[PDB]
Amino acid sequence: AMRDYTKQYINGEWVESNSNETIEVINPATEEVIGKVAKGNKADVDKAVEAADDVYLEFRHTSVKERQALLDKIVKEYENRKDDIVQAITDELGAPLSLSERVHYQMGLNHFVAARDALDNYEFEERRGDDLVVKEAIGVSGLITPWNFPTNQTSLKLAAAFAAGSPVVLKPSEETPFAAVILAEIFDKVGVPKGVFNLVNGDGAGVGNPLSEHPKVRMMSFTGSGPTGSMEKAAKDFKKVSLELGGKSPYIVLDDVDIKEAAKATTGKVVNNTGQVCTAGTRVLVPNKIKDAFLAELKEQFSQVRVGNPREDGTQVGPIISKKQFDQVQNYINKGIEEGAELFYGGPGKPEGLEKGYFARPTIFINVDNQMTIAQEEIFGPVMSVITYNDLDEAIQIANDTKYGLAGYVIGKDKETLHKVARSIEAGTVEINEAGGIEEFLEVKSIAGYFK
Amino acid sequence: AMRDYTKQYINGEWVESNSNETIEVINPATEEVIGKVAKGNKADVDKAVEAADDVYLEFRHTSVKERQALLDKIVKEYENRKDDIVQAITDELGAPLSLSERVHYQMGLNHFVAARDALDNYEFEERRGDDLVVKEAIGVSGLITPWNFPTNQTSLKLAAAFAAGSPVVLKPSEETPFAAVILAEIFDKVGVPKGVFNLVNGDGAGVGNPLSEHPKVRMMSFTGSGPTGSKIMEKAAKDFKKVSLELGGKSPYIVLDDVDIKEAAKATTGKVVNNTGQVCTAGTRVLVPNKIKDAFLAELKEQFSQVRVGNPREDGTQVGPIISKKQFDQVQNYINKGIEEGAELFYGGPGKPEGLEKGYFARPTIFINVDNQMTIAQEEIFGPVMSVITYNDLDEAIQIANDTKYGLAGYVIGKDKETLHKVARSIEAGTVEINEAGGIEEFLEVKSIAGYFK
Ligand SMILES: [Mg+2]
């Protein structure tokens, strides 16, 4: 049941790419080719950007009620596509079937519902004295989205842009294009106006680069790796840029913790989505006194992690997304071993019986010095680095020495200690004890003397 | 007398620069050098950034009433320095004395007042369910400020950073460092804690580049030219610093056919000549209806004659000189480019006015029969040069008004209210002005702690 996706969605219809080349989409679990998309070029981008540019004033000044109605149609049709979306995510990403529906599918639906509902009370116009302040769509927006959560960032940005009235040109990851294609089918069926949504498949060089360079794109929203994030080509055109960051996130374990619970929680942060999450708990800070006991429970917990085929019942962890990505995970593991980090559990290679498909082994390094490569750099795989600490201020100092500011975690009993740690960690998000966007597309204009 | 400003203000004291070299500051009106500042280097920057880095955690967590009282001390001392500030601005910028007092000085004062007052009630902490959401100072922030309003962007950013609890490293324009030096004196006198404010004078290569590239600077705030802006924002792409760029533009002024001709000429002339046309929001493109064209130009010729260009310290001078020789030449190059392209010279022209050959003085200049595709239509001149573009139907006017690379400002002057509203709403700009009618968040970032109260 091969999928031929090679057409691009531009100006209200599916059209053949200007490029004669295609990109094979691979199932990370079986290594087999499940379909293909266009390997897109500048010509595709230019055609799509022009189509967006032609409609941007029309979309901007579309009434809020009208845009909300469109979002409702999208909500309905998205639900109609539920099984198609779950199957696609499982196939292309390698996510277990249960997580495909309850996490990946649900995320997308939530973003669209939230955007539609926000338009009930959102104020695009405010009177101050004799002056009127308005908020309007920024206009044509480029979107480059990650593979790790193909429905997440994609649905979020599209829902926001549609709510705002900004038309878009989307390049999904060539690694996981299928969910984006379905969204395009959805948009086409509910009839989002011609030019408002455009889908151009391809890679960074063929598509990503020209899109970020296009003079008629007023806004650029990117999600992905650090180097590609470097924003340099959008500084020439002075595009508004939304950064998305990788991270090495510390998980600090207090010495008063229930050890089994800490082991469960930290394992979960590392193992989830095969460890490819930007917020993952890959650096675990443990007290010396409870170190041996914690490691013992940790080893136990890892052995019970279920790594295998996503379509098979019970699978917790699927494969790594791609050969290239799988290789990077292996190299980082090998590098930690070269550094003299003691390998506690797992390590390089594939699990027995899993030799087909890219399957990383959940891996624990212990006695890690924070200056080590596996400590400093983002692996994007199920690799945990355990770092011991004697006192709390030391743990904080370690947790805070990183290039990344993305996320942090702490688990323990004593409240003030938990609060001291949480407040001390410098990150946008800190989570204690496993506790369970439209502005971006808008511009503010003040009209002076409107009323007088 | 000659000001020796060659000392940097770093780590709570006036210190000798690590550099052995200096930069001369010139009076735009007299062409003489009125003083010197350090030509700063990477070493000065690193010392300043480290001094800020050492204190940033403490300043972030200092209390609201503490920062507010600091700003209040600043407000008071800023008022004490009023004459010094006015003289300095006039000397270094070339702004007329009355404008330096009424506009430049006042702007800075208002900024510190607004920031102080805003802290009266501002919510840095909000509980949501069992989660805590806090707004905290982003930490060490670099500031690079322009010469066209030396006390404006400087005071605005400094007040915001102080209100937020972010320490700063400031590099002022080496064209207009004096106002910034005075601010430093004020901050030192009222006892802004050491490391919180740092002044490093120099140019783009010695100071601006190392500052923008510094791994310990978490935020960069820049106001100035486009070319430099792209340059600095590109250097901030490696560290993924938060960047705020504020840039110039070509702002259309749309005149309706029902307007009063004299007041139209009065309004449009004012928007062009103010601050010798160096304003980012300047009204440099003037769109006039084809029917009132001849009558408008005649009154426009009359209004420009009433514009007094000359010595800033001379009583009644409306318009001073251009800031610098380099910038004066740029204005000249644009005026010539207009002639070269076939734009019709109406009033003014290239060269200095008769009677000032000394100082950099551009003649207020009107071009008519201008096509919007011309260079003088499409590019910011930063001088008192007006391009008059006629239109037939209002749809054409909006089209021309919105064909520019800039989104900065727009103006419409007329009578019919529905027409004014439509034009105002149609112009793409951040600020639109109908009939000549009359922050801290930048330095804060949000941190959510999940299950804080759980
Ligand atoms: Mg000067």
Coordinates of C-alpha atoms in Angstrom, one line a residue, chain A residues 82 86 89-90 96-107:
Chain A
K82 CA -8.3 10.2 12.8
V86 CA -2.7 7.5 13.5
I89 CA 2.4 8.6 12.3
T90 CA 3.1 5.0 13.3
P96 CA 3.8 2.9 19.0
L97 CA 0.2 2.7 17.9
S98 CA -1.2 3.8 21.3
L99 CA 1.0 6.8 21.5
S100 CA 0.2 7.7 17.9
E101 CA -3.5 8.1 18.8
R102 CA -3.4 9.5 22.3
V103 CA -0.4 11.7 22.0
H104 CA 0.4 12.6 18.4
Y105 CA -3.2 12.6 17.0
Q106 CA -4.6 14.4 20.1
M107 CA -2.0 17.1 20.1

